[PDB]
Amino acid sequence: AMRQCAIYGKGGIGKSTTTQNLVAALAEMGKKVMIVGCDPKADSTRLILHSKAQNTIMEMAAEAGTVEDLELEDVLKAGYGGVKCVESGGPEPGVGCAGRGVITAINFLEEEGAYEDDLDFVFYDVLGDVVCGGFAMPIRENKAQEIYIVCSGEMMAMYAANNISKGIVKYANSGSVRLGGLICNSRNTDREDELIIALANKLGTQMIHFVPRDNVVQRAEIRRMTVIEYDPKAKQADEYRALARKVVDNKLLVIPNPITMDELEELLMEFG
Amino acid sequence: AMRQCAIYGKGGIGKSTTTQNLVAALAEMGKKVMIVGCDPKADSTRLILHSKAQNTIMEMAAEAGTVEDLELEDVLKAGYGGVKCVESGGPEPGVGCAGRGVITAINFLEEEGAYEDDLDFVFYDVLGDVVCGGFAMPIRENKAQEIYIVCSGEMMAMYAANNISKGIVKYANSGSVRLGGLICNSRNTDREDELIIALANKLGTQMIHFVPRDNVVQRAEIRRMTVIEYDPKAKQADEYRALARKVVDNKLLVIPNPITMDELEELLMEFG
Numbered sequence: 001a002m003r004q005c006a007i008y009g010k011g012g013i014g015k016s017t018t019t020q021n022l023v024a025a026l027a028e029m030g031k032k033v034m035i036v037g038c039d040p041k042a043d044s045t046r047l048i049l050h051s052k053a054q055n056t057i058m059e060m061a062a063e064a065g066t067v068e069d070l071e072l073e074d075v076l077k078a079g080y081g082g083v084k085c086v087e088s089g090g091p092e093p094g095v096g097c098a099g100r101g102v103i104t105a106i107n108f109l110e111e112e113g114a115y116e117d118d119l120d121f122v123f124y125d126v127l128g129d130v131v132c133g134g135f136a137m138p139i140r141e142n143k144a145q146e147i148y149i150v151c152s153g154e155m156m157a158m159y160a161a162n163n164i165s166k167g168i169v170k171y172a173n174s175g176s177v178r179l180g181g182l183i184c185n186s187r188n189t190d191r192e193d194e195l196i197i198a199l200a201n202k203l204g205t206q207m208i209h210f211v212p213r214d215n216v217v218q219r220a221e222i223r224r225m226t227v228i229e230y231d232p233k234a235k236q237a238d239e240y241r242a243l244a245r246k247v248v249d250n251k252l253l254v255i256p257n258p259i260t261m262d263e264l265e266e267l268l269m270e271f272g
Numbered sequence: 273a274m275r276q277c278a279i280y281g282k283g284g285i286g287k288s289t290t291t292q293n294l295v296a297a298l299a300e301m302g303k304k305v306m307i308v309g310c311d312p313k314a315d316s317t318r319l320i321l322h323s324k325a326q327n328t329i330m331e332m333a334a335e336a337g338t339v340e341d342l343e344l345e346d347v348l349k350a351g352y353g354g355v356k357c358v359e360s361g362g363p364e365p366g367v368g369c370a371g372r373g374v375i376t377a378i379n380f381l382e383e384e385g386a387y388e389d390d391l392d393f394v395f396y397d398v399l400g401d402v403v404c405g406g407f408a409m410p411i412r413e414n415k416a417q418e419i420y421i422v423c424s425g426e427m428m429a430m431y432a433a434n435n436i437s438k439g440i441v442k443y444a445n446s447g448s449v450r451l452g453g454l455i456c457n458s459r460n461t462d463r464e465d466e467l468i469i470a471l472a473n474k475l476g477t478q479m480i481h482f483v484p485r486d487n488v489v490q491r492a493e494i495r496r497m498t499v500i501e502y503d504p505k506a507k508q509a510d511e512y513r514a515l516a517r518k519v520v521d522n523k524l525l526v527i528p529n530p531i532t533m534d535e536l537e538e539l540l541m542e543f544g
């Protein structure tokens with residue numbers, strides 16, 4: 001068995017930072033993990049690979065001729081803790097559908113046998129500002145059974161969490177895609193943890209962890225590393241270890257209950 | 273003549289707040305303006321209308337039968353300063369293409385004669401996290417000749433500005449869509465104005481205004497108003513008046529020069 005997990009959320013909320021640090025902590029624990037980048041920004045694996053970014057399946061297939069001329073061993077790259085990394089890519093802005101590379105990538109990985117029985121976790125890092133095209137395909141096509149949404153007390157981030165939840169509900173009659181929890185990536189505001197707990201309860205899920213804002217993240221990323229690798233003694237490293245433990249132990253996977261904008265605004269108004 | 277202007281930027285950066293306050297200031301000046309919401313969040317006109325939001329063309333066409341059964345006078349609503357307001361709408365998350373309503377809306381407005389000679393400005397408020405589908409159509413189909421990008425010192429916001437610029441370049445051989453400037457919506461960080469000026473110079477444009485972060489915005493929006501209407505004496509009201517004056521007077525419209533991620537990172541590193 002392997003747990004197929006997707007990290008969704010609005011742009012810039014902390015998906016790739018949270019995912020790579022969570023995965024580093026899982027690898028540190030002894031888990032075998034693959035990260036699949038499903039964001040056109042295509043820097044979802046750089047901290048595992050110590051790299052600028054990673055060349056994408058779309059890019060590599062174009063240079064090789066067809067996706068059939070690609071071998072899995074040419075595409076997947078291993079970094080910190082043996083974590084395996086791949087980037088989907090996508091068309092240039094203004095051309096096509098921004099999520100088209102996600103469909104190409106996941107189908108390639110499936111056919112080429114990337115989902116080997118020895119993997120414990122697969123994490124998809126997915127753009128969540130729109131829920132359509134290839135960005136909806138992990139939900140629509142039952143690729144990510146456990147959705148974790150990174151958010152914050154920001155209204156836009158909470159709106160995005162509610163939006164992604166509506167997409168989960170839409171495909172509830174097929175497959176087994178479920179909401180596993182909210183991850184609060186703090187903006188250093190008071191009662192923020194209480195706010196995201198309250199939102200999770202309204203949606204029917206939980207806040208699986210409150211990730212503090214910590215400058216050590218920037219110091220690690222300037223050096224192309226996770227905090228886990230950069231400074232294993234950091235308080236923030238222990239925060240990501242706590243998040244990873246709770247994801248491993250999580251048993252609550254639900255069809256969420258999206259809320260109205262009135263209840264969203266009441267939440268913000270309540271928690272000041 | 274009328275100037276057709278589009279406001280792009282990442283989610284939650286301040287597009288709708290900046291657009292509605294800019295437009296209120298133009299109306300206060302004596303300009304006739306229409307706002308066309310091109311974001312599925314569909315709250316781009318609420319501060320002009322003093323409303324929760326606005327029912328969308330997609331929603332109204334579905335209740336009426338077809339978009340042909342809609343009349344323009346049923347769809348367009350006037351609010352503060354006589355500003356005319358319309359929302360595109362879009363499909364629910366997980367269904368279709370999130371930008372499909374933008375195409376329906378702009379075509380409806382064109383055929384129904386909404387672009388009457390007496391208008392001075394039209395502002396489209398456009399989701400910019402992906403540049404595809406209906407969100408690319410104002411650029412691809414030459415609807416918004418003047419693009420203004422709201423951003424901040426946030427790397428994601430600057431990335432989005434560079435992404436949107438690549439979409440402008442892609443359609444440079446047709447029509448006349450051009451980058452008119454960057455608008456810095458402050459996160460209250462030092463040298464932020466210098467950073468966005470530097471980014472604009474690299475792209476070949478300008479920073480048309482630095483909008484401060486000011487709590488009066490929230491106090492106005494809680495009451496469903498622009499700052500211009502809520503507190504015309506506020507310092508922030510004068511900031512939006514300054515932005516509106518410089519948009520009116522702007523003559524620099526360019527095919528931008530998108531930068532690499534190395535120059536983006538060097539910018540952030542430089543300005544601390």
Ligand SMILES: Nc1ncnc2c1ncn2[C@@H]1O[C@H](COP(=O)(O)OP(=O)(O)O)[C@@H](O)[C@H]1O
Nearest residue numbers: 011012013014015016017018211212213214217
């Ligand atoms: N807990 C945190 N503390 C400090 N900085 C953070 C934290 N989480 C994310 N960041 C910073 O926020 C920025 C955006 O995060 P990222 O993971 O790239 O967002 P996304 O992948 O959702 O677009 C990055 O510069 C990252 O270093």
Ligand SMILES: Nc1ncnc2c1ncn2[C@@H]1O[C@H](COP(=O)(O)OP(=O)(O)O)[C@@H](O)[C@H]1O
Nearest residue numbers: 283284285286287288289290483484485486489
């Ligand atoms: N200059 C500002 N000062 C204070 N708050 C702001 C400012 N600009 C925007 N905001 C707040 O930021 C939030 C998001 O702005 P909004 O215009 O809705 O973003 P977008 O339309 O780009 O998603 C809103 O709550 C708004 O009140």
Ligand SMILES: [Mg+2]
Nearest residue numbers: 015016039044
């Ligand atoms: Mg990312």
Ligand SMILES: [Mg+2]
Nearest residue numbers: 287288311316
């Ligand atoms: Mg908006």
